[PDB]
Amino acid sequence: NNTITLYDLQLESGCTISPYVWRTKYALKHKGFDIDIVPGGFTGILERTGGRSERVPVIVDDGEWVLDSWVIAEYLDEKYPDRPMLFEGPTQKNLMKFLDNWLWSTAVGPWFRCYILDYHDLSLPQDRDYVRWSREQWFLGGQRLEDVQAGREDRLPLVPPTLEPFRRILAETKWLGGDQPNFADYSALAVFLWTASVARTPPLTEDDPLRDWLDRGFDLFDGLGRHPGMNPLFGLKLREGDPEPFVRQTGP
Amino acid sequence: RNNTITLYDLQLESGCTISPYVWRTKYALKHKGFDIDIVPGGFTGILERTGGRSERVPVIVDDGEWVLDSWVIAEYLDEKYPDRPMLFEGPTQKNLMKFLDNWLWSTAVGPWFRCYILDYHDLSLPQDRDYVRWSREQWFLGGQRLEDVQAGREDRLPLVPPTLEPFRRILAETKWLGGDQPNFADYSALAVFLWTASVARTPPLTEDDPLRDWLDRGFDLFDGLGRHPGMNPLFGLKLREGDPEPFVRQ
């Protein structure tokens, strides 16, 4: 007090990679708490916690253990209604999940393959083996990470245009939460926060309209998304035959 | 004014509402507990029917207040009647339902429009038929004639159910988009399927589609608002050997 312990999932740079952990960090700072960060990575999670969890994020509030990023957010609104609210109501929760699933299929799907080797190489030394064989086999390969990531220069141009439905929303609002951000923003942002933690070449063009919301989000809470290990999201260079990355239109 | 608001409808020959914008307005009004004074009429003569006030419907008249556009009407009701059940819970709902609505219009309305545009024409009021024909055959392209656009729908309709899975995924975990009770998010989404049911002379969904629970409860709301005599069934799509599996069965 005013502190809550958080079990992180970090890269070798100390930088968070897990989007679930990312939106939980933002949710905690939204509520105005200080975070006691427990470092670590993909391996040894059960041992790092008291045996209470095989997954992160996990928080400990005084001595109350809360598992699952979604549950954590609901817990914070329930126990601390006096601090800035994360959810507007039940309708937000349902429509959030629809947006989140779409971002995951549209952005995370393709980008995961484009950065799967960077993902591995940027991980903690103890993690790299576990990440290698399991990722190139479970999620899956069926073969190896150098072969899956190869050719990303050809895939990355194809993603920006597909994000237009999301651009369409942010064109007419400052935050998903309106004039101020909430968990809808943080959950959406987590997709791009993960991407920045592993993207050793930028997935978006320098003038993508998303940049306004993205930079503001990453700057929130004293630069929560500006950890020294983070990579630029912007700088994608396109070719004559590439698709236009976004709709260029003004503006009645 | 008792408890009454006037609504300029957009009806087919059966008296059934076709416009999804009008549909979600009917639900919004009933959600607020109002009685609806319906002004009938179809696609033609809207400027005549209104005071020269609108070329489009829905329009409502609340005592002397004329209100245009279904989204604005919903906001107007929440602003003027904060004592009656809320349509929006806040700004976040508004932003995220636009995202869902946009997706539903791209995924469901677009393909089903092409599949039912001739039925749409045939079911409209007699005085609207030629206008709907000429209008649609120049604007939304399709394009050819109504007959050509709708031709081959038996091969296209089986392709739509699989693409609705992202929407199923949400409804499999909640009673309503609004939670334990419906609100404008539900009514806006339902309006897509209400429109479809008004023009679909062959069913677009299988009898066992997991969407049916929400759809039937939705259509049944407010004394069967979605059960007007003219409505066609959404269910009964007959899949053939080659067709894709319509939904995830896990």
Author numbering:
A (entry chain B): 4 to 255
B (entry chain A): 3 to 252
Which statements did the authors publish about this structure?
Following oxidation of the α-hydroxyl group in GGE by a Cα-dehydrogenase, stereospecific glutathione (GSH)-dependent cleavage of the β-ether linkage in β-(3′-methoxyphenoxy)-γ-hydroxypropiovanillone (MPHPV) is catalyzed by the glutathione S-transferase (GST) enzymes LigE and LigF, forming β-glutathionyl-γ-hydroxypropiovanillone (GS-HPV) and guaiacol. LigE catalyzes stereospecific cleavage of (βR)-MPHPV to (βS)-GS-HPV, whereas LigF catalyzes the cleavage of (βS)-MPHPV to (βR)-GS-HPV. Consistent with their classification as GST enzymes, LigE and LigF each adopt the canonical GST domain fold with an N-terminal thioredoxin domain (residues 1–82 and 1–76, respectively) and a C-terminal α-helical domain (residues 93–255 and 93–242, respectively) connected by a short linker (residues 83–92 and 77–92, respectively). Biochemical and small angle x-ray scattering data suggest that both LigE and LigF exist as dimers in solution, and these dimers, related by 2-fold symmetry, can be seen in the respective crystal structures.
